[PDB]
Target: RE_R_Pab1 domain-containing protein
Amino acid sequence: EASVSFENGKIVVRLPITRPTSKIRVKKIENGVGIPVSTRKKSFPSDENLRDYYIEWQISFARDGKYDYELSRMVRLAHEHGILTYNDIYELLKFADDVKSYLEDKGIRRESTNEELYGFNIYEDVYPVAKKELPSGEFIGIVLKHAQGYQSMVYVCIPLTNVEPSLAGRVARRNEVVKYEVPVDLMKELLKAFIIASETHKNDIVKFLRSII
Amino acid sequence: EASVSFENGKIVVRLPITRPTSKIRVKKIENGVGIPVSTRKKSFPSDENLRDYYIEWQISFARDGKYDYELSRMVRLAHEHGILTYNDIYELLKFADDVKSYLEDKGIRRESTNEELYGFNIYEDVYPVAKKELPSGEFIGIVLKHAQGYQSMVYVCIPLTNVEPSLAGRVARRNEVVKYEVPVDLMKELLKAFIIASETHKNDIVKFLRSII
Amino acid sequence: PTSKIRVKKIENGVDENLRDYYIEWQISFARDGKYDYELSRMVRLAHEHGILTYNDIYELLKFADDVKSYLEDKGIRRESTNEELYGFNIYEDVYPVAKKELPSGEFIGIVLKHAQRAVGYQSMVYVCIPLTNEVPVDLMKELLKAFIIASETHKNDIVKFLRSI
Amino acid sequence: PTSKIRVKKIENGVDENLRDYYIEWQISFARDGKYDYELSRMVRLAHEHGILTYNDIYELLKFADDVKSYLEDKGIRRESTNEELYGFNIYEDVYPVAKKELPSGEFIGIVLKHAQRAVGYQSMVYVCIPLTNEVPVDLMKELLKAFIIASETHKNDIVKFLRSI
DNA sequence: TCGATTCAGAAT
DNA sequence: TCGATTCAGAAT
Model:
């Protein structure tokens, strides 16, 4: 699990970089796709291609029907130390009152083709995703999958240049976690992502934001 | 599980008599204690000692945080068919407002003794129970045990003479369940038992009774 | 944890917190009519290895000879109290337990329950071993005396086994 | 249910309801470098028993010879759409699947996933057997063709195995 | 082993 | 096997 804390007027979270099978994994893009990286055998580059490396974090809001987990822990600490203001939360709830279409409304569909593969029928499964680049460098993703109805999952991708210590020209350490100072806009954009992800997610954001106001 | 239904202006439940390891088991009292009975090998008596036979049913109110189970199913059907009236439910809630001491307040304690058993220290574990005889013949029991804090369990004991068919002078049949017409006073006394059992149980009775009013 | 051997910890009476963790063992004496299971195995194996001597069995046999009262004789009693809890009569069920601590830390408990399927009682022996703690010789001897003071049935079963070895 | 062999049922597309229940088998071709596991066992065992003839392997070898496109060539493509969902850009990920139903009821599916740990893709073959339905001969032959049309890696692995028997 | 998840399994 | 309950285990 990632450690959430507050130091020097910032919400920071500590992200492990040697658990590639967790919801927090280090990736590097090669020609537009993300490929996982063995952070203990391959030693990180000492150059500009380091920006192509990033941490992909499947961030959640709720756990066990409570809002004391990851994003809800970051938002509450941000609230308690005046990092997230009254108007910040007020604008979000007024944004939620205005949001009326959601990512899950796009659905998942299997499309028939005019293509055949040597006697095998060919189909195209079309899945919707939402992506947003922030000026600070991070990417926020929302992908839709089938409920194991639909369930929508929020991702945040953090460039390695945005965290300390600098891993440039070195290999990750054993059980190494990394310090990441969370910009306030990212916390707001993450709450926005959950608001527009689905109506179910939105009601959780709305119900949580109203409780701290 | 016992079947709950409504027939001819009565709430009736069907009680299985060949599941001696369930929460519904047939007992017979021998000198003041209840002893379980093999209803498929021993054939029931054809005489007056048949009253000494009874069905012991550990009755619950809630399941999975919902009130759609056993007593809550009997009370709701009784409500929907005018068997349990508005004033019936009103008197119960006014009874709950007046109840302020509970069975779990007696606690469980281990008492030291002046007795010794050949080098072994002797203790007495004292457990509280509540028992009530109704004019119709049934007994209602509340026993307190340790949470696997305390948890209190409600029992209702139904004489075999109060159910049909008459098992007098015969052995139970394979997978035989038995029809029992539930007197309205027993449903009220069962809700009373849960009200006084513990404050936790009372809040469930109060919260359920207020929802159907 | 659902076996007769399960690990628990003391919380509210029911680093240095490792002393609160112990293994509870619902230990048996016989199985399949013959006395070669759990306790009866320890006792015979120790008696064969010289760990238990000839004089050790006399003390147990003589001690068994002197025993008249048993834990099941106390029984479970439902005591009437003159209390009413909003029309409900209050009673107390008095279960008797015998406890004994050993210098090394292990506890031995004997508890009483209504005889299932039958009329009467059923007694059972437990040993609670701290996780900080192999079988001490004095442990085996107090376990036998545990079964000897539990009930006359268990005593006759223990006496019968000791005369064989 | 957590194995590669799990039972599911059709609900909303994803008595007579027993037709909706089927067994999903994530079936493999090779294991431990040698071709004697699951499918490769069925194929060799059937070829030895005369269930599969010499002419049956030519059809598969000739059919493999004629194959140029593979399911992994389609790849997974993230398509841009000109839509915005309150400041969030919407895209579509297009996963390609090949399906084939057999007259007895069984389905064969081949799905594509991003190559884990590596760059590229990883293809996998499934067989969905109705609970109302033993291995038909035509099943074994379409499973091979499933692996032959999945990827050139799987095709070269199938071609290499067929020339051995 | 960790990691993820939820079922089926052991227990008496 | 049912019955009761909740943990630990199998799965890859």
Notes: The interface with chain B takes residues 14, 63, 66-67, 69, 71, 78, 85-100, 108, 110, 114, 116-119, 145-146, 149 of chain C (CB under 8 Å).
